[PDB]
Structure formats: structure tokens, C-alpha cells
């Protein structure tokens, strides 16, 4: 469950994820009509002074049985219009996003392991 | 009846620019076989990426799930899913940077995830400078 | 310096003669794919890091983790 | 099956390739010419040439042997012991 | 003799009939899907089928950590750190998803719940993925490692040094201070041991259970 | 000693010379002192230990695969300061530079 002013770890190969910076890239909002979000769910994120979308990619909390549990909170920036900001995902991603409804073809495509 | 022979043949009717057919194995639990295609323009792409979908819907099952187009919204990059294959519809220079093509033949060998480092906690738990 | 100097050339035979038994994908494209590959990142470097591209290489001539059809 | 083949004609097969290449044109090439030296052409460049003759002729080519294809002159005479013309 | 923990009841005012039902039911399950003995020491790969690819065939290996749960729904987390990150997977075993379960490394650990992994260095929670079973010869006790974890800064997920945790798996000499002992020993409780009205006796539940087994074989 | 301006070379980099000079020289005294184990010539481990013992650190918070970690971030600008402080007192002992 990720909400408003959670920090959060960039799985990405993006410049502005990996790139050092004095605070931790921080919820803004959750697009979602309960503040809580999941995996699938379209954040906003403050990263280095600027607000940016980004997909949540596994999160501590428990959810249903068989799908696995992160030990950190992460997420892949995305642009407005949809497309992944960074070119490669190293961090495992749960195989639950393709049928869940949205724009996850490109995510899975850059995405390079499975858990 | 619609499979990877119907896709390619599509494709090529439509004049697509380049089109590449990657078959990853099932060890890689995603698809039997992954589709990356060029287009000229973005007109194009939304022309190639209907066109397979009405051609899709007239040949599937009843009990062949409806396919949604992705990343209509974007000029640069269309993707299509299907049970068995997955199409990704990109112009030329997003095709070059992202270079999907080394990534599935090449899975954990790309040469853009030598680049990257994974993270390391400093000993003892005490930051330096 | 490669593992051999024919060895990286033998990897560039066997993948251009692979290229000639492609059925879906552009013949045209896959010879323009390893032309642009095998000289611009596999030209000029040093021997530490020229072994791992052929491996590379290798991983991609086997194809167990894909092969292009 | 059997088609009407010469030594004559086996050279004029072999420049016709040579000039459809990108890297070489008629101006500089030769009947007599070096690919590693008046030509300039790279170790990898070699190979696609190789190719060219193992699909135009449809006989496999050894890795092996394939190193020593060069300075097109040799590649007739190779190629010579397939359908051998006295002349 | 071994019996598996989801086949003893949790203490109620539940029909025993109903555990009965649920007991045939997991019974059959166990004929047609061979559920190995481990404990939660023990490495464990399972097999699975994912409904979300097109009946494609997904292995993990893992550490378990925690079995929890009774009857049908009985549950196994087990744990793995793959490529810097640390996952963990609840499977259900009666699941009929789940292809096979294999026990790579059969073994116990010093504690019956190995949670604090979480909070132990990332070294202890990473396996091999390709790592070979070993096979443990037919007539001999499962062996017990004696393995204790060092573990992270004291910000933890739980407060292991509390004794009702009762965690003997910890190098707490390394990170904490007789004071943090101390401290933590004021949360004894020693009269809780001696309680023998909050004891539960399973011995002629579990022989009903194993004439129920018997039978059904 | 301090008779020559400051502004003209850095708090962090006195640490470093210093250490230098008194690795030449009596050693055993400044580790006893500061309860470091032995002396090295790194100037990052003798700034770890003056911040230890004097117990002015921050724990900071950084989110790992294996979970977020506490690690600690000492003031390294106020270490700076008590070494060359101890230093110029009777403190850490009578040792000559030149
Ligand atoms: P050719 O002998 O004219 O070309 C030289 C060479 C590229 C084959 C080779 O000798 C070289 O200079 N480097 C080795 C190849 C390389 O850079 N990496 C290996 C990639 S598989
Ligand atoms: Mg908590």
C-alpha cells in the first residue's frame, strides 16, 4: 500500500531514478479513488524537484496468496502520455500486471525477470 | 484462423517498414512469440494497429478474449496484446534507443544492463565523506 | 584480444549463415542488425572486455533464451 | 541440373557481385586486387563477400578455409574445382 | 512419525466433523499431489501454474520461513533474495495450481519462525536458484542447523529481543547491550511457562488423525 | 596551531595532516584517547571513532531490495573541529610538529 508522502525505491534504468540526490523520491498522490495504492496503480512522484508519474512494481505489503511480497516499495517512472522514462528494469516484476487492466505491455516488454 | 503466419502476412500487406518475429522460449513465462514492427509515421502505426485488431476480432473464437490497443495517446510506441503473441507497433528512432530486440534474444547478457550497478550498503553501517 | 581472433570471426560466419534460413523476419534487416553490432561495440577495445561480447554472441547463437524467426 | 558454365564466365559472376557491394565500386576494383590492402576491407567485411558465393553456387564453405579466401583471383580457382574447366 | 501441521486442529468449539470433511478432501489432494515433509528450515522449490501466462510453468526456490494455517487452506512462505531483492511468496499447498513441491534442503532450524530474516543481513535470506537437492539417507533424524544470523541496525521490523518472540536464532551479543537486555527482561513473564491450563495436548488428536490416514491409504 | 588564516585551507583537510604528522610521531596516545584500536593512516576511520565517542551521529534511512536500512551518517564537520580542539589543548598530549 502506497499513499501520499511515501517514500519510495526507482527500479529503473533512468537517469533521474538513479541519479544521487539529498531526499528520497516521495508520493504526491495516488490515482486511485481510495488514497491506497497497489500494484498496477498510477503514482505521482516528487523526484529531484519535479513532479512525475510513475507505476507501482511490487510493494511490502501482503496481498493474495500467491503473489509475491517486496521487501522495498517500487515503481518505474512513466511519462503523461504513458511510456517508460527508463529503457531497462532489472528488479523482479509480478506476472499479475498483464491481465490487470491498463497499460502494462510496455513495462513487461522492458522488464527483463519475473516473480 | 488467426496465428503468427495470418500476423506476419498482416503486417507485410500494410507495408510495414521493418518486422521482426523473436519466438522466446516458455522457460520466460510471457508470450510464445514476441512482434516488434516500424512504422513511418504515427498515422501509420494507428492505421497497422486497427487494422490487425478488426482483422483479430473477425477471425477469433467466442471464447477468445477482446485485445486492447496500448499507448494510443503516444506517437511513438503501440503495443497489442494477444493470448499467444504480443505486437509492438514503434517508429525507428524509439525502436533504436529501447532495441527490444537485443533484450529478449538476450536476456540477462543485454549490454545495456552491464551498464547498470546494483546498489552496495557501506560496512559497518557508517556513510563515508 | 577475444578468446580467438577467428572466434569472433566463426561467431560472425555461423550468425550471417542463420540469417539466410529466416523465414518471418527481414532478411535485409538481421545482416544491418549484427553489421552494426559486430563493428561499432566489437571493433576497438581492450582484452579484458572483449571475451564477454563474444559470449554475448554466443548466448545469441544458441538462442536459449530466444532465437529470431 | 547441368547449366553451360566456363572459366570466362565464373569471373564475370564473381565481378558482378563485387560491384553490387556498397564498400568497393568499379572504379578501384580489379580482376588483380588485395581486399586486406587496395581495397581496405576488414577482416569481418571478408565474410559477407564469402556469403555471397556460398548461396550464389549453393556449396558449403569450411570456417576453416574461409580465412584464406582472398585476393579474388584465388576465389575463381576455389571455386574452379567445382565443374573443373581445363579451357 | 511426522505429521503435517495443518492436519492438527487449533483448539475451538468446532464440530469435529468438520474437520473430518476438510481432512478426506486434503487426503485426495495429497494422492494426486505428493506434499513432501519439510519444516521451516528446510529449502523448498515449488511449481506452479500461473493463470495470468497461457499455462506457462513458474519454478521458485526459497527458505520458508513461517507455516501457518489449518486444513485446506494451509499456507508456507518462503523467502529468497533474487538480483538485490528480497522476495517472499505465501503458497497454499492444497492450491491445485501448485505442479510440485520439492525439498532441495531438508532441515530445522533453531526457531520455529524465521521472520527475523527480514531484519538479518540480506546474506542469510539469498539461495542459489540452480542449487542441486540433496537427499538425506531413509533411516536417520532431520538435522538441525545451529545457525545464528547477524543482523541490521536496530530499527527493526519487530522487536525480536522481547522474549515472547522466545528467539534463539540471534547473535544479540553483536547488536545489542546488556542494558537493551535488561530492558527487554522486563517483558519476562516467567509465570506464562508454568501456566498448565494454557497447554494444549495433541496426542489423542493426532492418533485419531493417524488412523484416518491409515485408512485412507 | 591556527596563528595563520583559515581561509586559506579547509577544516576536513587538517584532519588529514595531522594525522600524518602524528603517525611519525607518538601514535599511541591520540587512539587511547579516542578508544580507537590502532592507528591508520585514513582519515575517514579516525573521524568515524572522534564522532563515536563523543556520540554525535545521525541515522539515516536508505531503502534497499533487502529492505530499508539505518545507516548512520556522522557529523564529520564537527569531528573536524573537537580533533583540532583536543589537539591545541593539553588534551590529546605535547607533541611538536616541526
Ligand atoms: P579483421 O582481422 O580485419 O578485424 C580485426 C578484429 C575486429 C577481428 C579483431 O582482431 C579486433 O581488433 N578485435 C577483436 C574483436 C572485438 O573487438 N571484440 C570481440 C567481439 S565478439
Ligand atoms: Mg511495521
Given at each position: 500500500?502506497?499513499?501520499?508522502?511515501?517514500?519510495?525505491?526507482?527500479?529503473?534504468?533512468?537517469?533521474?531514478?538513479?541519479?544521487?540526490?539529498?531526499?528520497?523520491?516521495?508520493?504526491?498522490?495516488?490515482?486511485?479513488?481510495?488514497?491506497?495504492?497497489?500494484?498496477?496503480?498510477?503514482?505521482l512522484l516528487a523526484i529531484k524537484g519535479q513532479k512525475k508519474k510513475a507505476l507501482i512494481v511490487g510493494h511490502c505489503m501482503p496481498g493474495?496468496?500467491?503473489?509475491?511480497?517486496?521487501?522495498?516499495?517500487?515503481?518505474?517512472?512513466?511519462?503523461?502520455?504513458?511510456?517508460?522514462?527508463?529503457?531497462?528494469?532489472?528488479?523482479?516484476?509480478?506476472?499479475?500486471?498483464?491481465?490487470?487492466?491498463?497499460?502494462?505491455?510496455?513495462?513487461?516488454?522492458?522488464?527483463?525477470?519475473?516473480? | 484462423?488467426?496465428?503468427?503466419?495470418?500476423?506476419?502476412?498482416?503486417?507485410?500487406?500494410?507495408?510495414?517498414?521493418?518486422?521482426?518475429?523473436?519466438?522466446?522460449?516458455?522457460?520466460?513465462?510471457?508470450?510464445?512469440?514476441?512482434?516488434?514492427?516500424?512504422?513511418?509515421?504515427?498515422?501509420?502505426?494507428?492505421?497497422?494497429?486497427?487494422?490487425?485488431?478488426?482483422?483479430?476480432?473477425?477471425?477469433?473464437?467466442?471464447?477468445?478474449?477482446?485485445?486492447?490497443?496500448?499507448?494510443?495517446?503516444?506517437?511513438?510506441?503501440?503495443?497489442?496484446?494477444?493470448?499467444?503473441?504480443?505486437?509492438?507497433?514503434?517508429?525507428?528512432?524509439?525502436?533504436?534507443?529501447?532495441?527490444?530486440?537485443?533484450?529478449?534474444?538476450?536476456?540477462?547478457?543485454?549490454?545495456?544492463?552491464?551498464?547498470?550497478?546494483?546498489?552496495?550498503?557501506?560496512?559497518?553501517?557508517?556513510?563515508?565523506? | 584480444?577475444?578468446?580467438?581472433?577467428?572466434?569472433?570471426?566463426?561467431?560472425?560466419?555461423?550468425?550471417?549463415?542463420?540469417?539466410?534460413?529466416?523465414?518471418?523476419?527481414?532478411?535485409?534487416?538481421?545482416?544491418?542488425?549484427?553489421?552494426?553490432?559486430?563493428?561499432?561495440?566489437?571493433?576497438?577495445?581492450?582484452?579484458?572486455?572483449?571475451?564477454?561480447?563474444?559470449?554475448?554472441?554466443?548466448?545469441?547463437?544458441?538462442?536459449?533464451?530466444?532465437?529470431?524467426? | 541440373?547441368?547449366?553451360?558454365?566456363?572459366?570466362?564466365?565464373?569471373?564475370?559472376?564473381?565481378?558482378?557481385?563485387?560491384?553490387?557491394?556498397?564498400?568497393?565500386?568499379?572504379?578501384?576494383?580489379?580482376?588483380?586486387?588485395?581486399?586486406?590492402?587496395?581495397?581496405?576491407?576488414?577482416?569481418?567485411?571478408?565474410?559477407?563477400?564469402?556469403?555471397?558465393?556460398?548461396?550464389?553456387?549453393?556449396?558449403?564453405?569450411?570456417?576453416?578455409?574461409?580465412?584464406?579466401?582472398?585476393?579474388?583471383?584465388?576465389?575463381?580457382?576455389?571455386?574452379?574445382?567445382?565443374?573443373?574447366?581445363?579451357? | 512419525?511426522?505429521?503435517?501441521?495443518?492436519?492438527?486442529?487449533?483448539?475451538?468449539?468446532?464440530?469435529?466433523?468438520?474437520?473430518?470433511?476438510?481432512?478426506?478432501?486434503?487426503?485426495?489432494?495429497?494422492?494426486?499431489?505428493?506434499?513432501?515433509?519439510?519444516?521451516?528450515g528446510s529449502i523448498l522449490r515449488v511449481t506452479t501454474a500461473d493463470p495470468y501466462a497461457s499455462g506457462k510453468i513458474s519454478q521458485f526456490?526459497?527458505?520458508?520461513?513461517?507455516?501457518?494455517?489449518?486444513?485446506?487452506?494451509?499456507?508456507?512462505?518462503?523467502?529468497?533474495?533474487?538480483?538485490?531483492q528480497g522476495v517472499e511468496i505465501c503458497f497454499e499447498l492444497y492450491n491445485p495450481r501448485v505442479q510440485e513441491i520439492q525439498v532441495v534442503?531438508?532441515?530445522?532450524?533453531?526457531?520455529?519462525?524465521?521472520?527475523?530474516?527480514?531484519?538479518?543481513?540480506?546474506?542469510?535470506?539469498?539461495?542459489?536458484?540452480?542449487?542441486?537437492?540433496?537427499?538425506?539417507?531413509?533411516?536417520?533424524?532431520?538435522?538441525?542447523?545451529?545457525?545464528?544470523?547477524?543482523?541490521?541496525?536496530?530499527?527493526?521490523?519487530?522487536?525480536?529481543?522481547?522474549?515472547?518472540?522466545?528467539?534463539?536464532?540471534?547473535?544479540?551479543?553483536?547488536?545489542?547491550?546488556?542494558?537493551?537486555?535488561?530492558?527487554?527482561?522486563?517483558?519476562?513473564?516467567?509465570?506464562?511457562?508454568?501456566?498448565?491450563?494454557?497447554?494444549?495436548?495433541?496426542?489423542?488428536?493426532?492418533?485419531?488423525?493417524?488412523?484416518?490416514?491409515?485408512?485412507?491409504? | 596551531?591556527?596563528?595563520?588564516?583559515?581561509?586559506?585551507?579547509?577544516?576536513?583537510?587538517?584532519?588529514?595532516?595531522?594525522?600524518?604528522?602524528?603517525?611519525?610521531?607518538?601514535?599511541?596516545?591520540?587512539?587511547?584517547?579516542?578508544?580507537?584500536?590502532?592507528?591508520?593512516?585514513?582519515?575517514?576511520?579516525?573521524?568515524?571513532?572522534?564522532?563515536?565517542?563523543?556520540?554525535?551521529?545521525?541515522?539515516?534511512?536508505?531503502?534497499?531490495?533487502?529492505?530499508?536500512?539505518?545507516?548512520?551518517?556522522?557529523?564529520?564537520?564537527?569531528?573536524?573541529?573537537?580533533?583540532?580542539?583536543?589537539?591545541?589543548?593539553?588534551?590529546?598530549?605535547?607533541?611538536?610538529?616541526?
Amino acid at each position: 500500500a502506497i499513499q501520499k508522502m511515501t517514500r519510495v525505491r526507482v527500479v529503473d534504468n533512468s537517469a533521474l531514478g538513479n541519479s544521487p540526490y539529498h531526499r528520497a523520491p516521495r508520493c504526491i498522490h495516488v490515482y486511485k479513488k481510495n488514497g491506497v495504492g497497489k500494484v498496477g496503480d498510477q503514482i505521482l512522484l516528487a523526484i529531484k524537484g519535479q513532479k512525475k508519474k510513475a507505476l507501482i512494481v511490487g510493494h511490502c505489503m501482503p496481498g493474495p496468496r500467491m503473489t509475491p511480497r517486496f521487501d522495498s516499495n517500487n515503481v518505474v517512472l512513466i511519462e503523461d502520455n504513458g511510456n517508460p522514462v527508463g529503457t531497462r528494469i532489472k528488479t523482479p516484476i509480478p506476472t499479475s500486471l498483464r491481465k490487470r487492466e491498463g497499460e502494462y505491455s510496455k513495462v513487461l516488454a522492458i522488464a527483463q525477470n519475473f516473480v | 484462423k488467426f496465428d503468427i503466419d495470418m500476423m506476419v502476412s498482416l503486417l507485410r500487406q500494410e507495408n510495414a517498414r521493418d518486422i521482426c518475429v523473436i519466438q522466446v522460449p516458455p522457460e520466460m513465462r510471457y508470450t510464445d512469440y514476441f512482434v516488434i514492427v516500424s512504422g513511418t509515421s504515427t498515422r501509420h502505426l494507428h492505421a497497422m494497429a486497427f487494422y490487425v485488431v478488426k482483422m483479430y476480432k473477425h477471425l477469433k473464437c467466442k471464447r477468445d478474449p477482446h485485445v486492447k490497443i496500448e499507448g494510443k495517446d503516444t506517437d511513438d510506441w503501440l503495443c497489442v496484446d494477444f493470448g499467444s503473441m504480443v505486437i509492438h507497433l514503434m517508429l525507428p528512432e524509439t525502436r533504436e534507443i529501447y532495441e527490444l530486440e537485443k533484450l529478449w534474444t538476450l536476456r540477462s547478457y543485454d549490454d545495456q544492463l552491464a551498464q547498470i550497478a546494483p546498489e552496495t550498503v557501506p560496512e559497518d553501517f557508517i556513510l563515508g565523506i | 584480444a577475444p578468446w580467438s581472433r577467428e572466434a569472433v570471426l566463426s561467431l560472425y560466419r555461423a550468425l550471417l549463415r542463420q540469417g539466410r534460413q529466416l523465414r518471418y523476419t527481414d532478411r535485409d534487416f538481421y545482416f544491418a542488425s549484427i553489421r552494426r553490432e559486430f563493428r561499432k561495440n566489437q571493433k576497438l577495445e581492450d582484452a579484458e572486455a572483449r571475451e564477454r561480447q563474444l559470449e554475448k554472441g554466443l548466448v545469441f547463437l544458441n538462442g536459449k533464451l530466444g532465437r529470431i524467426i | 541440373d547441368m547449366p553451360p558454365l566456363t572459366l570466362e564466365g565464373i569471373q564475370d559472376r564473381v565481378l558482378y557481385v563485387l560491384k553490387l557491394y556498397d564498400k568497393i565500386d568499379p572504379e578501384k576494383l580489379s580482376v588483380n586486387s588485395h581486399f586486406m590492402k587496395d581495397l581496405g576491407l576488414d577482416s569481418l567485411d571478408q565474410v559477407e563477400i564469402i556469403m555471397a558465393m556460398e548461396d550464389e553456387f549453393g556449396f558449403e564453405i569450411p570456417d576453416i578455409d574461409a580465412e584464406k579466401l582472398m585476393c579474388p583471383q584465388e576465389i575463381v580457382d576455389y571455386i574452379a574445382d567445382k565443374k573443373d574447366v581445363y579451357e | 512419525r511426522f505429521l503435517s501441521p495443518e492436519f492438527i486442529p487449533r483448539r475451538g468449539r468446532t464440530d469435529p466433523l468438520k474437520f473430518q470433511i476438510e481432512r478426506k478432501d486434503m487426503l485426495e489432494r495429497r494422492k494426486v499431489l505428493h506434499i513432501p515433509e519439510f519444516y521451516v528450515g528446510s529449502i523448498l522449490r515449488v511449481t506452479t501454474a500461473d493463470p495470468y501466462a497461457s499455462g506457462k510453468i513458474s519454478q521458485f526456490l526459497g527458505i520458508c520461513i513461517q507455516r501457518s494455517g489449518r486444513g485446506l487452506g494451509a499456507t508456507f512462505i518462503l523467502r529468497n533474495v533474487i538480483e538485490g531483492q528480497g522476495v517472499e511468496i505465501c503458497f497454499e499447498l492444497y492450491n491445485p495450481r501448485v505442479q510440485e513441491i520439492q525439498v532441495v534442503k531438508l532441515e530445522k532450524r533453531l526457531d520455529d519462525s524465521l521472520l527475523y530474516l527480514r531484519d538479518a543481513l540480506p546474506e542469510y535470506s539469498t539461495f542459489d536458484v540452480n542449487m542441486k537437492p540433496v537427499v538425506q539417507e531413509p533411516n536417520q533424524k532431520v538435522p538441525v542447523n545451529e545457525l545464528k544470523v547477524k543482523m541490521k541496525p536496530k530499527p527493526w521490523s519487530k522487536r525480536w529481543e522481547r522474549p515472547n518472540f522466545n528467539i534463539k536464532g540471534i547473535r544479540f551479543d553483536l547488536c545489542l547491550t546488556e542494558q537493551q537486555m535488561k530492558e527487554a527482561q522486563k517483558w519476562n513473564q516467567p509465570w506464562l511457562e508454568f501456566d498448565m491450563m494454557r497447554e494444549y495436548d495433541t496426542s489423542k488428536i493426532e492418533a485419531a488423525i493417524w488412523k484416518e490416514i491409515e485408512a485412507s491409504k | 596551531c591556527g596563528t595563520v588564516l583559515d581561509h586559506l585551507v579547509g577544516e576536513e583537510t587538517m584532519a588529514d595532516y595531522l594525522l600524518y604528522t602524528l603517525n611519525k610521531h607518538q601514535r599511541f596516545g591520540y587512539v587511547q584517547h579516542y578508544g580507537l584500536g590502532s592507528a591508520c593512516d585514513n582519515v575517514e576511520r579516525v573521524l568515524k571513532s572522534v564522532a563515536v565517542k563523543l556520540g554525535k551521529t545521525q541515522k539515516v534511512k536508505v531503502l534497499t531490495g533487502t529492505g530499508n536500512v539505518n545507516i548512520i551518517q556522522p557529523n564529520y564537520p564537527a569531528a573536524a573541529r573537537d580533533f583540532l580542539q583536543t589537539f591545541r589543548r593539553g588534551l590529546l598530549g605535547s607533541v611538536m610538529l616541526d
